[PDB]
Amino acid sequence: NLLSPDRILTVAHRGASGYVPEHTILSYETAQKMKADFIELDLQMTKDGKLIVMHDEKLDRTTNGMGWVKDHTLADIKKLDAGSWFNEAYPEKAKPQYVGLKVPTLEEVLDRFGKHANYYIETKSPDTYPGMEEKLIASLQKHKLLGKHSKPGQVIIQSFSKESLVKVHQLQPNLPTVQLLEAKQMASMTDAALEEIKTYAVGAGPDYKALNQENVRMIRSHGLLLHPYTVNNEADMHRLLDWGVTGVFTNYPDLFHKVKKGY
Numbered sequence: 001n002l003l004s005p006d007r008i009l010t011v012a013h014r015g016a017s018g019y020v021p022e023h024t025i026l027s028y029e030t031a032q033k034m035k036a037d038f039i040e041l042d043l044q045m046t047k048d049g050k051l052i053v054m055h056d057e058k059l060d061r062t063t064n065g066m067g068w069v070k071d072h073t074l075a076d077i078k079k080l081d082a083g084s085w086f087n088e089a090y091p092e093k094a095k096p097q098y099v100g101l102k103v104p105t106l107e108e109v110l111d112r113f114g115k116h117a118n119y120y121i122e123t124k125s126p127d128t129y130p131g132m133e134e135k136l137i138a139s140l141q142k143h144k145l146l147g148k149h150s151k152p153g154q155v156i157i158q159s160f161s162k163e164s165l166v167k168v169h170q171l172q173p174n175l176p177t178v179q180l181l182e183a184k185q186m187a188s189m190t191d192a193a194l195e196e197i198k199t200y201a202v203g204a205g206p207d208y209k210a211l212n213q214e215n216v217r218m219i220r221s222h223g224l225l226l227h228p229y230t231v232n233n234e235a236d237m238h239r240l241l242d243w244g245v246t247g248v249f250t251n252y253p254d255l256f257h258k259v260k261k262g263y
């Protein structure tokens with residue numbers, strides 16, 4: 001069971017993004033081959049209302065385009081190069097085949113992997129994107145990833161926005177959510193706050209730098225899954241697993257897969 005506290009989950013942060021440009025089909029394919037349990041998506045929305053996968057609200061960092069995603073049509077965004085930026089930023093990891101990779105839609109990612117992947121999907125800035133949760137759920141429903149014979153945990157919805165997750169939970173009670181937390185939030189965490197999270201979410205996803213043995217124990221004592229982000233070096237993977245987290249977001253899913261076998 002994907003949602004079992006006894007199972008350690010490898011969540012490939014924006015795919016195998018330590019090796020391949022984030023949020024490209026190729027990044028997700030690479031994560032799959034590296035035995036990731038989940039491929040992780042960040043959602044934005046185009047001017048014509050299409051959900052696409054991109055971390056930033058703006059095109060500037062990971063494409064040769066400029067401006068807010070929501071000011072551009074999907075057709076115009078599909079003209080962009082979403083791979084070359086990676087070759088430039090990380091020359092030592094550059095590959096010729098990264099040139100010309102495209103921004104995928106949510107629909108394209110679900111179409112690519114179907115039920116062969118598990119999806120960890122974040123609603124970014126959902127208050128700025130009317131209808132984001134409904135469109136997301138509609139896409140999941142039509143790709144047969146929802147329903148009550150669906151595999152529990154095949155999709156997890158995550159967000160920094162509590163509002164977004166409460167909305168998802170109200171619309172789809174059996175769709176597991178995970179509340180994301182910044183270091184500043186996690187540092188002042190209370191039992192009351194965790195009990196509140198537990199009413200709509202099955203787990204918490206904090207900045208791992210805010211974690212210690214005591215508050216890992218605290219989170220787990222509430223029966224919450226615990227998936228800290230973003231864990232990229234092996235020593236920290238060991239430390240967190242030793243403390244008792246139940247998975248991580250990582251840019252190096254192959255490395256975490258190896259580490260977790262010892263726990």
Ligand SMILES: O=P(O)(O)OC[C@H](O)CO
Nearest residue numbers: 042122158180205229249
């Ligand atoms: O990488 P960010 O900025 O989306 O941070 C949150 C983690 O990815 C967990 O979704």
Ligand SMILES: [Ca+2]
Nearest residue numbers: 040041042122
């Ligand atoms: Ca994310």
Ligand code: NA
Nearest residue numbers: 060061063064
């Ligand atoms: Na750019």
